[PDB]
Amino acid sequence: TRKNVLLIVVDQWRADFIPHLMRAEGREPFLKTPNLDRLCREGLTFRNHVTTCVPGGPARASLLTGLYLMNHRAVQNTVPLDQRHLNLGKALRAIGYDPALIGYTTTTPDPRTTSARDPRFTVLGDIMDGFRSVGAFEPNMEGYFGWVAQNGFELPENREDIWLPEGEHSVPGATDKPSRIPKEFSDSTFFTERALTYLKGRDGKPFFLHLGYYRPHPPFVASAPYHAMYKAEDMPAPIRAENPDAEAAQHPLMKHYIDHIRRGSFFHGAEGSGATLDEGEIRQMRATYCGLITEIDDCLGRVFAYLDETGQWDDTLIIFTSDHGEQLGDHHLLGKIGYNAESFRIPLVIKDAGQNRHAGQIEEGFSESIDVMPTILEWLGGETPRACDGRSLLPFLAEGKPSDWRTELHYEFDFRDVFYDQPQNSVQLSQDDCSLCVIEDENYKYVHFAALPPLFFDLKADPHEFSNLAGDPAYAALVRDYAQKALSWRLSHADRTLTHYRSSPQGLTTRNH
Amino acid sequence: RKNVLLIVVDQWRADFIPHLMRAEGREPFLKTPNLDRLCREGLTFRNHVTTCVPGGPARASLLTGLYLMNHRAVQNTVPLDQRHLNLGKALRAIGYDPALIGYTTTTPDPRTTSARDPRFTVLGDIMDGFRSVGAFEPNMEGYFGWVAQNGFELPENREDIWLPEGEHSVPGATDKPSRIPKEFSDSTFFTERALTYLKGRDGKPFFLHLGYYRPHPPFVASAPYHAMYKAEDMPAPIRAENPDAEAAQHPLMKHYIDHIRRGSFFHGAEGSGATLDEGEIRQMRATYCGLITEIDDCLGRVFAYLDETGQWDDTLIIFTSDHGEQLGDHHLLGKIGYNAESFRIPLVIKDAGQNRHAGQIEEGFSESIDVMPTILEWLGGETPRACDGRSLLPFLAEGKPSDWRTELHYEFDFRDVFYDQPQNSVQLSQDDCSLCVIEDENYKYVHFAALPPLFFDLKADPHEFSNLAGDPAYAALVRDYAQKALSWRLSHADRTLTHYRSSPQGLTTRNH
Amino acid sequence: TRKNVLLIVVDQWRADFIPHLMRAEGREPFLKTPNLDRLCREGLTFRNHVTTCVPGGPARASLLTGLYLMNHRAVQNTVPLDQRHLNLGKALRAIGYDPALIGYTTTTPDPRTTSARDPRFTVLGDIMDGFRSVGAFEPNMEGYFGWVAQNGFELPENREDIWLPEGEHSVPGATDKPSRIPKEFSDSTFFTERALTYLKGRDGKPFFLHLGYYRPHPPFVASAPYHAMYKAEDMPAPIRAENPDAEAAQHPLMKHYIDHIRRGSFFHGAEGSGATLDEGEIRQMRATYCGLITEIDDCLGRVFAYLDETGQWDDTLIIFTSDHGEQLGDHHLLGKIGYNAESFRIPLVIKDAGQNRHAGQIEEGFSESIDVMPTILEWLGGETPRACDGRSLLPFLAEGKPSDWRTELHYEFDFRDVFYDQPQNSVQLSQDDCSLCVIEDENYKYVHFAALPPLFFDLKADPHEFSNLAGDPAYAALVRDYAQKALSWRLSHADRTLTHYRSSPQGLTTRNH
C-alpha cells in the first residue's frame, strides 16, 4: 500500500487570505486560488490555526520539531537550534521515509558541534541537519540566482534589483509596475520545477517532500501579469489606530517596531518608515501580495497535475500551511513581530488519502504549528515522539475534535537583540528578559511579557486589540484567570525528553500516562 | 591555598538552628556547639529554600544550579539528562578534584547507558562527574560492609540495627536507643571517610562534598543521643483540628494524609503518619535533635583536623541541607507537597580568613540553586551561562545586590513513582502533576498545573491554614503573584545557547 | 586575497589514458582531451599516483578523509564509515569554506548515529555528512533521471534502458551503436550543468566545489557522436595471459574474479563472462571508453570557459583526478578489483593559482589519494589534521619532492562478501581475514594476503605482473625486505587521533615530534 506526504509550506501567507473561508462567511473572495480551492473542497480547512512563534527561524523550528519556543530555544533568527531536539527529517528516516526538502529552514547550527568559522554562522541561517536538500534557496538565494543565470537570463550587478519595479520612471515602494524578471524565472517557478524534477525522479516510489515557497514573503513586487491582476480598490483596508503614535502608546514593544520598521525591508529599493504608508499605498501592496499568492496557486497547479497524471493524488496526504503571518499594514506595522493576531494566524488545509470524510468542511478547533509534525508521523505509521509539545491532528480527520483538545491558542515571541534589530535599546532590558507569551480564545486575549507590562483584550468588544484592559481593576479576576491558564500551560509543557522513565527494583521501565 | 567543604545533611529543618533561636529571643532546645561555631565565624541565611524535593530533585538542583523546570529530574527514580553541567564537571574545569562523600540519588541517562545497568535497579546512585571517596552506595552497602568489617555482627535483615533496643520495645516514636553503637553509626562512617580523604590530601587544595544521611529517618539514635533530649521540652506540632480538616484544604494534601505511613519514619512501625498524637510527635522530635547533635559531634572531629593542619582559615565552609521535613507539622511526615517546612533549609557560609559579616543573619531570599555558582566563582571560575542560580559572594562583601530576587521559588512534581502513586488520588496524567510556589514576606502563591491553586496571607496566616485564592476580593493579588510566577518562568527558560548569534562577521556572543 | 578550489573527480578513468603523458613517452595519443591538455600545459602532472583502495566507497573514503583503509575501515561498498573520522567537508567548514559537492560519495552511514530503517541502508551508498549537496546523482541516480524527465525526454519503463544500444535488435555488449539518450541529456551534461549553476550562483565569491563525474564508469555505451568518435583498430591491445584459466591459476582471488565477473555489470543488458570477451570486443570497449572521456573533456570546456569569462581561472586551484582505475580487459578482468596495477593507478593534475612555476612538467614522486585532502587544506590556509595518513603535495609546486617523501606506493583491498558478490565462497575465509596490502616501487611489487599466498613481481622484467616470485627460494631476502617495509608502514600509520597528547605534572600537553 503506497502512502505519500506533501508538506506545502509557504512563507508570510496570512490566515485571512483563503477564499474558501471567505465564501463560508458569505463574502465574495477578493483573490483567486482555484488549486487551493480544490485542496479545500476535497479536505479539512482549519480556521483557527497559529504558528507558535515568529519569525522564520523560530517558526520553522516549531514546525519541524513539534516543540514550543520555550522548549526548542531557537528564539530568534541567528540564534542556534540545539541539536538534541528531534526534527521531522530525522524522525521520517527512522520510519523509512527519505526526508526530501525544497526551500529553506533558516536554522542556525549548534556551535558545540561545528567550527566557529563555519560559513553557516555568516548568514541568517541554513538547512536543518536531517533533511535531504533537493532544491535549496541556499544562503543568499544563490540556488535561485544561479538557476536564473543558467537559464540565460542576465541579472543586474546588484542581483536583487530584479525586484525593482519596471520602467525607468517607477519609484520603489508599493507598485502597480511588474518586477524586472519574467514569470518563467520567478522564484515560485524555481521551487516548483524542483518539485517536479524530484517527483519525476521518484517514479512512483513513496515520498515525503517539504515544498517550500518563498512567496508571498517580500519584496512586494511580482512578475507580469501578477502585478496588475488585482486592483487596490478591491483590497480590504488596513485596521489601525488613528496614527502611528496612538498605536505606539499601547506598549513599549509596539513603539519600538513602529519607530524602527523600514519600507526598504518590504519593497526593494524603497526608503522610509513602514508605519507612514498611507491607506492607498497599503491597498496597492496588498494587491501585489494577492498576485504573488495567485502565482503560487498556478504553481501548485502544475504539481497537482503531475500527481493526477501519475495516479498519486489519492495516495497523498497533502498539508498546506504557512510558517507565519504578516501585518500588511495592520496596526501600522509591516512584517511579523510582536503580539498582534495577524502575525501568527496562518492557514492549514489537510487532504487525507482517499475520499476525505470531512471534505470541504471548516474546523473551528484551535490548532498550532507544533501539531503538524506529530500528524505526519502518526499518518505514516510511526509514534509521536515523547518530547513533542504538539498533538496529532488525525482525530479531526476522523470523528472530530478530541474531548480533551486544547481550549486556547498559545504563541510566543522573543525580541532580544540581533545584528539587524535591537529592541533592547528601546525597551531597556537584557536578553533573557525579552519575551512574551500569548494565551487567546474566542472571548479574550492575554499577552504576558517577561519584564514589561501585560496586555488584555475583550475580543468580542475589541477584536482588533486596540484597548488594553490589563490595568483595569474591574478585570482583575479575568486577567487572574488568564495568567493562571498561561502558568498551568508552562508547567504542563516543561521538557518531556526523559520524564516518562523510571528506575524500579524490576529495572528501567517506562510510564505511558 | 583555597579549600571548599560542602556539608550536605539530609532532612535538616531551617528552624532547627540555635543561632536563629537565640537571635529570636529563645533558649535553644538543642545543642550544636560546632555549627554554633560556624554561625559565629560566618553568615547564617534565614530564608533559604531548596528549589524542590525529595532527595534526587533537590540534589540535581543543588549540584547543577538549575530549577526543576530546567533539570527535569522531577522525582526520585526519574533520570537526569546528562546534557546538564554539574558541580563536579565544573570543578574539574577549574582544576579541582571533585571528591564526594555520601550520595546524590541521581538516576542515570538511558541514552548513554544500558537498560540492564544495575543503577536502574535502585532509587539512584552517585552522579557522573565526581570522585566517590566514601559512598553510602546503593542499598547502603558501603556503610553496612564498613560495619561488618569493623567486626560488628549484623542482623539477618541489616536495617534491623534501627529497631529500638529491647525485645519488648514498641517500634515507632521511641525513647529507647538503636541496636547499633555510635562508633558504628552511619554518621561516624561518613566522618571517617571525610577524615581519611582530608589526611590523604596532606595539605594540598581540596573540594569535598561531605554528605550525611542524618537527620533522614529512621528516627532512632545510637546511645547516648536517644535520651539526650526530652519530649516535654520540644516545640509542639503546628496542625489543623484533625487529619480531615487538613485533608480538606487541597486534593494533594488529601493524598498525602491518606497515604504517608509510619514505617517510612520509624523502622518496623506501622499505622498512619497523620494519626500520631502530639506526645509521639514530640518524642520523635527529641530523637531528631539527638541525631542532629550526633552530626555536630562529628563535625567537631572534622573541624579539629582542619585546625591542627592550619587549614581552617583557608577553607570556605558551607553548611546546608538538601531539603526539610514536616516533623508532624500539618499532620505530615516527610518532604512533600507545598508547605514551607519541606522546603526551608539551612545555609551557613564561613569564608576564608576573618569574616566581614561574622555572626550576622542574612534575610535575603536565597535558593539552593545559588550554591554551585557561589563555590565556582569563589575558586576563580565563571558561573555557567545555563545556571538559574546566582553567586552568593556579594552577601559576604557589601551585602544584597540591589537587583536580587524579591521572591522565593520552589517546585514539586508528584507523578507516580514505584512506591507512591499520587496520580490515582488526584486523577491526572504525569505531565500535569506539578506545582510551583512563589513566596515573599507577605504572601505565598502555590500554583498547580491542573488542580486548584492556593494563596496565603503570611502575616495573618503564617502557617498556611486558610486558602484565600478563591476569594473574589483577592483577585488582584492572586493575579499579581501568578503574574510574578509567569515572569519567572519566561525569564528562566533554558539558556544553553540563547546567548549566541550568527552575523555577517561570523559567530559571536551577547553578554547582555 | 581570493582563493578557489575546484576538485574534479571522475570515476573509473585509468592513469595511462592521459595524452600529456603519452606525448612525453613519444607515442601519438589515441584519444583527445584538449581541455585536460590545457591543465597539463599549465599545471603539474603526476605520473605515479594511486588510489589507496578500491572500489568506489572505500576509494572515496580515502580521498575524502586522508586515511588509508587500515584506518577508515570502510573496507567495501555497503560497509559503514565510522563517523569519528574527519572528512574534507568538515575540515573546510572549519576554515571558512562551503563544501559544495556534485556527484556522489557512495558512503554507507554509521549505524550508531542513524536508524536501522534509514533509507540510506537500502542502497550501495549516499552522500557523506559534511558536504553541501548542489548536484546529486542521489541514491538510484534519481537526481539525474528526474532532470531528464523534466527536460521533456521520455524515459523507458526500465529507466536504465537508455543505455541499451540503438536499434530494434542491436546485441547488448561491447558496441559501435550510440546509446538511446541524446548528449544534451547525458549524465556528463547533467553534472556539468549543475557545476555551472553552482558557479553562477557564487557570483565571484571564493568557492570550493567537488565536481564529480560518473563517467567514464560503465555502462560502456555513449551518446552520439561519442559512440563513433574513435575506432577499435586504433585502441591499445589488452595485456593478458594466454587464456582465462592460465590467468586464474596465479591466485585464488584472481580465479574468483575471472569465474564471476559478468558482462552485464559493464554493458547494459549484456550476458556472459567478462573473462571471455575476445580482443576485438575489448578494443571496441576501449574505443567507447575514449568516447566517454572526450565527452568529459568537452564538458570541462564549458566550466573552464566560465572561469575564464569571469576572471577566476588564475585564482583557482584545479585538481583533476579519479577515484579508481579500471582493468578494461587487462588480465581478462573488467572493473576495479584485486591487486593489479590498473585498478589502482589513477591521474592527478594540479594547477596552482597564478602562472605555475612547474607548468607542463611531469612529477615522478609516489603520490597517494590520501595526499589530496591535506594539499587542499594547507593551500586554503589550514592545517593537515593530525589523524591523516596523507601528506600535502604543495612542496612539489614549490621546490620539489621533499627529502623524506615516501619511497614506495601503498594500497589495500578487502574482499569480504557483500550482497552482490561473495568471494568468501571461493577462497573459503572469514571476513576479517579477507584483505591484501600492496607495496610497490619502480623495481618491485609485493602483494600480501592476510590468509592466502603472497605475490611478488619483478617489475623491470615483468612489468605486467604475470610471474609470481614470492615462493622462489632465491628471492627470500627480497620478499623479506618488502614484507618488512609493509610491516613498518603498518606500525608507523597506526591511528594518531590522540597519541600526540600527554598528561604531565604541568597538565595536559602536546608533543609536536
Ligand SMILES: [Zn+2]
Ligand atoms: Zn518566514
Ligand SMILES: [Zn+2]
Ligand atoms: Zn534527602
Ligand SMILES: [Zn+2]
Ligand atoms: Zn567509482
